[PDB]
Amino acid sequence: IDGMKLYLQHCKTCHGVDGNPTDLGEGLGARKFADAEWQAKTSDERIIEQINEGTPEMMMPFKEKLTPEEVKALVPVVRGFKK
Ligand code: HEC
Ligand SMILES: [Zn+2]
Ligand SMILES: [Zn+2]
Ligand SMILES: [Zn+2]
Ligand SMILES: [Zn+2]
Ligand SMILES: [Zn+2]
Ligand SMILES: [Zn+2]
Ligand SMILES: [Zn+2]
Ligand SMILES: [Zn+2]
Ligand SMILES: [Zn+2]
Ligand SMILES: [Zn+2]
């Protein structure tokens, strides 16, 4: 399973190639991933829950689109943006 390939296919349109949100993502409410303070207060389970369930009117749920293994493979991608 390629995490980065999944991210570019499903996430980059809102969150950006570097974790800095696009025009679409920012307008919907997304903040940058390369944020030390965000990374520090955010658990892996919070990242997994967000991918799975989304946020109403902000981010679609991905639980019917990706297996738990695919969701888990995205954690290091999100973590790898920092600074
Ligand atoms: C545009 C429709 C989006 C797509 C496609 C994806 N995400 Fe997203 N995400 C979006 C918004 C507007 C927000 C803010 C809403 C909120 O409740 O925080 C988010 C949030 C995240 C978060 C952070 C949650 C937190 O606790 O701070 C993560 C980790 C995240 N999103 C990851 C993510 C991944 C891995 C995606 C592809 C499968 C993805 N998102 C798609 C907008 C959009
Ligand atoms: Zn896919
Ligand atoms: Zn998709
Ligand atoms: Zn900060
Ligand atoms: Zn971890
Ligand atoms: Zn929760
Ligand atoms: Zn939950
Ligand atoms: Zn959520
Ligand atoms: Zn939220
Ligand atoms: Zn809606
Ligand atoms: Zn809706």
Author numbering: 33 to 115
Give me lines lifted from the publication on this model.
Anaerobic ammonium oxidation (anammox) is a bacterial process in which ammonium and nitrite are combined into dinitrogen gas and water, yielding energy for the cell. As anammox bacteria express a large number of small c-type cytochromes, these have been proposed to perform the shuttling of electrons between the various parts of the metabolic machinery. Here, we present the structures and biochemical characterization of two of these proteins from the anammox model organism Kuenenia stuttgartiensis: Kustc0562 and highly homologous Kustc0563, which show relatively high transcription levels. Kustc0562 and Kustc0563 share 37% sequence identity after cleavage of the signal sequence and display a typical type-I cytochrome c fold.
Indeed, Kustc0563 was the first protein from an anammox organism to be purified from biomass and also the first to be heterologously expressed and characterized. In the crystal structure of Kustc0563, the heme iron is proximally coordinated by His47 and distally by Met91; in Kustc0562, the iron is proximally coordinated by the homologous His51, but the distal ligand is an imidazole molecule, presumably from the crystallization solution. Similar results were obtained when Kustc0563 was treated with imidazole, but this protein could be crystallized without it. Spectropotentiometry revealed that Kustc0562 and Kustc0563 have redox potentials of +244 and +268 mV versus standard hydrogen electrode (SHE), respectively. Importantly, however, the comparison of BtCytc with Kustc0563 shows that the latter protein supports hydroxylamine oxidation by KsHAO at a rate that is approximately 6 times higher (kcat = 48.4 s–1, Km = 13.9 μM). The simulations predict a preferential interaction surface between Kustc0563 and KsHAO. On Kustc0563, this involves a ring of negatively charged residues on the surface around the heme, in addition to several hydrophobic and two positively charged residues. The predicted interaction surface on HAO displays a pronounced positive charge, which would complement the equally pronounced negative charge on the predicted interaction surface on Kustc0563. Moreover, in the related Kustc0457/Kustc0458 complex, the typical 24-heme electron transport system of HAO-like Kustc0458 is extended from its heme 1 onward with the hemes of the complex partner Kustc0457.3 Interestingly, however, in our simulations, heme 3, which in KsHAO lies at the surface of the protein at the bottom of the concave surface between the protrusions, is consistently predicted to be part of the interaction surface with Kustc0563. This opens up the possibility that in the interaction between KsHAO and Kustc0563, heme 3 is the outlet for electrons rather than heme 1.
